[PDB]
Amino acid sequence: EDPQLLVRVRGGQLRGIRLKAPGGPVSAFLGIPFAEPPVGSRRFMPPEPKRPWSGVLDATTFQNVCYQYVDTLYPGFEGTEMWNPNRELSEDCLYLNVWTPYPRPASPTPVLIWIYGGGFYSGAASLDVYDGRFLAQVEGAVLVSMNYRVGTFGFLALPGSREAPGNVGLLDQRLALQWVQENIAAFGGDPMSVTLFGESAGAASVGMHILSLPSRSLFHRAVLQSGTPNGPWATVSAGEARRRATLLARLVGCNDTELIACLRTRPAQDLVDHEWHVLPQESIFRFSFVPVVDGDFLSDTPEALINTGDFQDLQVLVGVVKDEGSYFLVYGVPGFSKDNESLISRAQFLAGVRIGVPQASDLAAEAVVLHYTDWLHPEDPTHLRDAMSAVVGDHNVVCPVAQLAGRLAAQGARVYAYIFEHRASTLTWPLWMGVPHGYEIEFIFGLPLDPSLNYTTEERIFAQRLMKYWTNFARTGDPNDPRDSKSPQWPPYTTAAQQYVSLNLKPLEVRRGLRAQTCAFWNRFLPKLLSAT
């Protein structure tokens, strides 16, 4: 049969499948195992390289989604189900996919590795929004995406113990990164030009591979979309991780060795049934089992590592969307709903601030309220609704992104920053949510170029601009086209000028100040306050 779909990696032979993109065919290799299935005795354990196989392994199908929590808030609603697993759940899930142009590239091609998001408790590399078909066909890119263990199976930790050291979900990603080093050349990819890019928890994971040295020799450039390793949600301390793991074992009827042995004896859903019951406070944008500051993978807190690291030969692309926190409000904040316009009172606004900032003392809570209050219209329900979205967005994404971009730029790194402001015509969420958390991904991957999904012609051309931005950054470390000269260049973000650009259908517009005033409150003041308590 077709030899273009027959590849030999270090573990055996694979059979790909020629898929059809709007502009031509592409070779896809879906479901390649990169690790032994972490089942039974290997639950909570670091992954290990997949053993070789005999014959021709069929790599034409998406494998199983890592066992994870499934959303139940809006059943049947496209806005939530598009992130739900599209394959059967299983702890046997350490598989990756490779897209490449058809025919296989003649020259070594830069590789983009996608790390999906989902709050470290959900997500899969098989969702339609992560379809590397278009980037491989239009830009000739070799695109890689891997599944990593999420939730308890990927990040339940009893720090110091050996049967649950923590961060094994991140170690899954690193093992797939080494698999790319050892095998992507057989697909036409260049192992010396590997760019990691991910969104939300995937962006945070990308940032942690920057801050973990064994991972750094596996990639060269990074893209962090709406997520950072630093911040209030991406990591936990060893003491808090041990508390949540112990409380989870108590809720399921379970010396560290004997405790984890008991945890290895329960169905996967038994653990998922109680993973949301370990958070210390009523919260939104807080996740139970996330990466842990273990002194191993993360030698110190992300804030400490970005404050003192040498990033001179690293190039990064960071950015946010226009409404980072609007999505999260309907998941625990009284007065918000996707169906009504969520015009809240003021008493609701303060009650929501205690949920959006669950670590804030009463004084720190008031400081947030008085800061985001429009003191000319202190009770106009439209602003307090929009302000509540801004509190969660700025606290968890925007200002953590601003602090990271400044620290990287200050210590040698080459930083490009953006804000994504276009709202998709196909969006099914209400308009008061604006551009919600994660709705730039479909444009980066080039989905508007599929005529069957009913995007506007300008959205189709907008997606092409973003694909060229990302691939140019992967090819060169610079998102600017070295072909098209043209009036406005995307300038590097610096600590002095603080320049970033806006990604919408209008041409590039350079702005200065990534919410410098508001993020000064979050990054500089509020740490000193949560200290006066």
Place this chain on the structure above:
Amino acid sequence: EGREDPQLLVRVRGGQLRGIRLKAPGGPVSAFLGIPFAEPPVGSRRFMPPEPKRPWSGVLDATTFQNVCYQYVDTLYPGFEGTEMWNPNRELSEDCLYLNVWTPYPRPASPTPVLIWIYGGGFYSGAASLDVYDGRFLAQVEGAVLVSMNYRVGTFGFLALPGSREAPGNVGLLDQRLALQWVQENIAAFGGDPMSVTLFGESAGAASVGMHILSLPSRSLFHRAVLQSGTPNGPWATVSAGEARRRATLLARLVGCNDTELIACLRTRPAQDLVDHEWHVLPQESIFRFSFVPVVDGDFLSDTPEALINTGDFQDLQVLVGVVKDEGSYFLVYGVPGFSKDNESLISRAQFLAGVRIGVPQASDLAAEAVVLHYTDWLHPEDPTHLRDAMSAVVGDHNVVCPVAQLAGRLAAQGARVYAYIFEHRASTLTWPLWMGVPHGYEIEFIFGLPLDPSLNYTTEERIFAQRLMKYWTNFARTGDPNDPRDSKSPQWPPYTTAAQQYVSLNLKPLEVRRGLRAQTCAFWNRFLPKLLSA
């Protein structure tokens, strides 16, 4: 009596007075200067409340200004008009409780509304005889009856050992009240209507006006109030009884002194000796802080000014309040390193933080950090021009603009009729540097109508502008409304409300309505900083 001007002889409760016919740009005015309204608070009466003036025999000559109350004299810029125009222009003496009256010439037939001026000067300086307080223009052009009194300042007016009998405190405010009583009894002899008495003052005079609003024995002596760049509430206008006692007992130590024995010693000290040590009793290195100010004594002020404006009914009451564009720039050249009137005062970020500790002397390390980060321009956090302007805004907002914004909001929500303004025009005659903008107190010369005097080298637009302000002030005195019913062709001045927060801009252009008086920044000063200062 016999060969004199019959239009200039008046009798008051204490005897007869001979006024003087003064010349104004567009006609003559009657002036009665140096009318004694109290027994000289000298000797054993130092620090004591004022007593009413015992009647005199014969005709008292009321043709020249009397003595200025003993006070500190500013000598930071010798011979510089910007500082000299506020210095005493008469002899310094503890014998200083005298007031002045300006009326049209001849004196009006029907009763005329009365404007009473209370000067400012941080409760340590000031005089009713300064040229910028000349009431001849308001009396000639607007036909108003203007009164201004001298009150004791500094230690002589506000040194207090609360609870004692020999130094009860607030005697400088009692000097003002006694003059308001003098107006109630005697202003009818000049053509003034004692049932239409409007108080107006600036800086500490505006604070004094506010304290008469919050003190009941004074509130029966007037009907309307104007507060220019000053409030009874705020960080500088008052001190607690314990702090006033501490500053008073410390000053006594610094000059060589049971309260009775202590004050008996202070009364034996020369007046200049108290002035020489007046500034040595401040708790910290500070600007816009004054050693001896009104004390919360549970008597004149039953509670703090903040407590009384929060719990007080003001439905009966119309006020005009406002600020100038640069309230704090004046005070920076008086203690903040890096600022001078002779250079551009471009400062570094380090000097900006050093100044924040001086401008906010009561702030902890954390509170001072909140001010610095709030006022920092994070796109140019080391630009010396913004840092210098931020330092001016910190002092101006903390001491004036936000206390005024706090006062207008509380009074309006409690039923009062409030009109608010921001004075934005810089006098073409200003001798201060341009970077100071419109400094503290440089709207007074326009409200009193000094640009009408042709010899003062003002522009013609400034003369027209001054006339427009005089009518704003006098219409509010006449009606409780600065607006003109004789002219609907000019834009109207809406009251300040909690809903709309409307105020107007006072400059060389027609009235322009604005919303919110620095709402975001003053929420930090008025709402957040007090709560954080509890830590």
